[PDB]
RNA sequence: CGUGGAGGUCAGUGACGAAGCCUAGACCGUAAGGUCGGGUCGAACGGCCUCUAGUGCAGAUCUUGGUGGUAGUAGCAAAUAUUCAAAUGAGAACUUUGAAGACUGAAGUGGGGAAAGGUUCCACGUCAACAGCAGUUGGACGUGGGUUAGUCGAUCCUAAGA
């Protein structure tokens, strides 16, 4: 499980694209084996940010979704712009 | 022919013998029948304030006489009634007893 | 194509058909045999009068234990009814046939229904 | 149109049951577009939706 | 469209790994791109490239 | 007398139409059966000497499939009950809004859960079938969205028991 297996995709539904705007929260899809330590680590190392907390949930389709909140010194809009999707 | 008259419908004798559950749902049809006989039309619409005065006292509490006011009018586009209809409305009176039938001026 | 037995001239004619309809076979056979042989405008007037209970349809073969009426005298029966669904289907197919005849360029004032037939779907 | 959803959300925002909300009948095509609690909070604010006061149960006879 | 085995059969034991991480980064960004693009044929090439490298590494 | 297959012959019939099927049209035989004509149809099939057998049906409250009369017949009668106008729509007794009339009556036709179910939750569109009349409605049909815990549960402990 490298940090390229851990973080699988970003989630781009227009309900999720509002948390990045108001709540300052990046929504990700991670692997069914990662935990709230590895998710924090992988995000921090890939985008050089300050993670405040991570919440997770195993969806009915089968995969696992992460809610990663950032600190008041960063901007999820700009980080998602760098990743490309907005 | 546009025209407007006032009427007193004796509603006691048209409901005599009807089941209690169906007295107020039947004064409705009796009034439509009345208006069709008099104004000779086929489309009859009742103002929703005549519904209130028919149902004022429940299903089995219709009045004995009703003072009405009927108007024959011209119908609008997408009509199949060639081209008239009646609009029935209630009038306000102390009693509904002792009144003949008159013609309203406009 | 391949209609039932129709002895007539196929140049002065028009056709119309409908298959797999959710109607009653027994009721539709009577409202077909009722207008079988009439003129077009007369038949359409008749079917318009039936929908207002001004005239009836003589039930002549599928008629067990239905009730008698006074509108069966015009035809010579006592049993008669008013199948609305069947009358509507038949008076749609009739309008289709009339439009087809107009397309072929036939004279609408001379049109009589010369063949009409119903049978059972699966 | 179909204002079932708007009735439900309006009743949930005001704080009453579905039997105590009044959706104006002349402005149907404005409520047809209100599909968020924010839009409904605007409509209740201006007046297109009202609260329909409570039926009395007096105790004078008691 | 991809790597060649007789090419890879001489490269050093470190350029191989750096190639692996480059191809995996490429796939990672390609998933985010395909999150909007209709259909992309570079995926079937990059997967088989990763695999053709890992084979020689194992050998 | 007729049926499926096998050996021999008729240098047999055939896309210019083999077999099959329809035919109050015809000829032969006491009969079982055989041969012609016309319609449809589309690729194989007969006569004679012999060999062989899973070899011929009206019945078995026979087996499988299909179809009738009854018959538009019996029937669609529990839970007091609906009415007016507008809107949408091809189309409204049954959808949506407003107005009136009633009901459950806090041991509720209200607000939550355990087990069980498994997407039935929500939005958009839509009516071939289904919801025992209807339907523009729907837990139906098609396409997407949705479940966030140091403090609530499991996880830990032991009971009858294994």
UniProtKB/Swiss-Prot annotation, chain A:
A single GO BP: cytoplasmic translation
Crosslink position(s): Glycyl lysine isopeptide (Lys-Gly) (interchain with G-Cter in SUMO): 5
Cell compartments where the protein resides: Cytoplasm
Keyword ATP-binding included in the entry's annotation: no
Keywords: Cytoplasm, Isopeptide bond, Ribonucleoprotein, Ribosomal protein, RNA-binding, rRNA-binding, Ubl conjugation
Domain of life assignment: Eukaryota
Secretion signal, residue range per the UniProt entry: none
SUBUNIT field: Component of the large ribosomal subunit (LSU). Mature yeast ribosomes consist of a small (40S) and a large (60S) subunit. The 40S small subunit contains 1 molecule of ribosomal RNA (18S rRNA) and 33 different proteins (encoded by 57 genes). The large 60S subunit contains 3 rRNA molecules (25S, 5.8S and 5S rRNA) and 46 different proteins (encoded by 81 genes). uL23 is associated with the polypeptide exit tunnel.
Its biological purpose: Component of the ribosome, a large ribonucleoprotein complex responsible for the synthesis of proteins in the cell. The small ribosomal subunit (SSU) binds messenger RNAs (mRNAs) and translates the encoded message by selecting cognate aminoacyl-transfer RNA (tRNA) molecules. The large subunit (LSU) contains the ribosomal catalytic site termed the peptidyl transferase center (PTC), which catalyzes the formation of peptide bonds, thereby polymerizing the amino acids delivered by tRNAs into a polypeptide chain.
Family: Belongs to the universal ribosomal protein uL23 family.
Protein name: Large ribosomal subunit protein uL23
Organism: Saccharomyces cerevisiae (strain ATCC 204508 / S288c) (Baker's yeast)
From Swiss-Prot, chain B:
Leftover remarks: There are 2 genes for eL31 in yeast.
One GO-annotated biological process of the protein: regulation of translational fidelity
Subunit structure comment from the entry: Component of the large ribosomal subunit (LSU). Mature yeast ribosomes consist of a small (40S) and a large (60S) subunit. The 40S small subunit contains 1 molecule of ribosomal RNA (18S rRNA) and 33 different proteins (encoded by 57 genes). The large 60S subunit contains 3 rRNA molecules (25S, 5.8S and 5S rRNA) and 46 different proteins (encoded by 81 genes).
Family listed: Belongs to the eukaryotic ribosomal protein eL31 family.
Organism: Saccharomyces cerevisiae (strain ATCC 204508 / S288c) (Baker's yeast)
Cross-referenced Pfam families: Ribosomal_L31e (PF01198)
UniProt xrefs under InterPro entries: Ribosomal_eL31, Ribosomal_eL31_CS, Ribosomal_eL31_dom_sf
Recorded name of the encoding gene: RPL31A
This protein's UniProt keywords: Cytoplasm, Ribonucleoprotein, Ribosomal protein
GO molecular function: structural constituent of ribosome
Gene Ontology CC annotations of this record: cytosol; cytosolic large ribosomal subunit
Protein name per Swiss-Prot or TrEMBL: Large ribosomal subunit protein eL31A
Gene3D superfamilies xrefs: 3.10.440.10
Lineage of origin: Eukaryota, Fungi, Dikarya, Ascomycota, Saccharomycotina
Localization in the cell: Cytoplasm
Swiss-Prot record, chain C:
Phosphothreonine carried by residues: 69
Phosphoprotein listed as a keyword: yes
Disulphides: none
GO CC aspect terms: cytoplasm; cytosol; cytosolic large ribosomal subunit; preribosome, large subunit precursor
Gene Ontology biological-process entries: cleavage in ITS2 between 5.8S rRNA and LSU-rRNA of tricistronic rRNA transcript (SSU-rRNA, 5.8S rRNA, LSU-rRNA); cytoplasmic translation
Subcellular locations according to the entry: Cytoplasm
Covalent crosslink: Glycyl lysine isopeptide (Lys-Gly) (interchain with G-Cter in ubiquitin): 45
Single GO MF annotation: structural constituent of ribosome
Main localization of the protein described in the UniProt heading: cytoplasm
Keywords: Cytoplasm, Isopeptide bond, Phosphoprotein, Ribonucleoprotein, Ribosomal protein, Ubl conjugation
Ranges in a coiled coil: none
Claim: DNA repair is one of the keywords in the record: no
Subunit record text: Component of the large ribosomal subunit (LSU). Mature yeast ribosomes consist of a small (40S) and a large (60S) subunit. The 40S small subunit contains 1 molecule of ribosomal RNA (18S rRNA) and 33 different proteins (encoded by 57 genes). The large 60S subunit contains 3 rRNA molecules (25S, 5.8S and 5S rRNA) and 46 different proteins (encoded by 81 genes). uL22 is associated with the polypeptide exit tunnel.
Extra remark beyond the main annotation: There are 2 genes for uL22 in yeast.
Family according to the record: Belongs to the universal ribosomal protein uL22 family.
Protein name: Large ribosomal subunit protein uL22A
Source organism of the structure: Saccharomyces cerevisiae (strain ATCC 204508 / S288c)
From Swiss-Prot, chain E:
Compartmental location: Cytoplasm
Positions bearing Phosphoserine: 12, 49
Family statement drawn from the similarity comment of this UniProt entry: Belongs to the universal ribosomal protein uL29 family.
Record's function text: Component of the ribosome, a large ribonucleoprotein complex responsible for the synthesis of proteins in the cell. The small ribosomal subunit (SSU) binds messenger RNAs (mRNAs) and translates the encoded message by selecting cognate aminoacyl-transfer RNA (tRNA) molecules. The large subunit (LSU) contains the ribosomal catalytic site termed the peptidyl transferase center (PTC), which catalyzes the formation of peptide bonds, thereby polymerizing the amino acids delivered by tRNAs into a polypeptide chain.
Top-rank taxon, per record: Eukaryota
Subunit structure: Component of the large ribosomal subunit (LSU). Mature yeast ribosomes consist of a small (40S) and a large (60S) subunit. The 40S small subunit contains 1 molecule of ribosomal RNA (18S rRNA) and 33 different proteins (encoded by 57 genes). The large 60S subunit contains 3 rRNA molecules (25S, 5.8S and 5S rRNA) and 46 different proteins (encoded by 81 genes). uL29 is associated with the polypeptide exit tunnel.
Record protein name field: Large ribosomal subunit protein uL29A
Extra remark beyond the main annotation: There are 2 genes for uL29 in yeast.
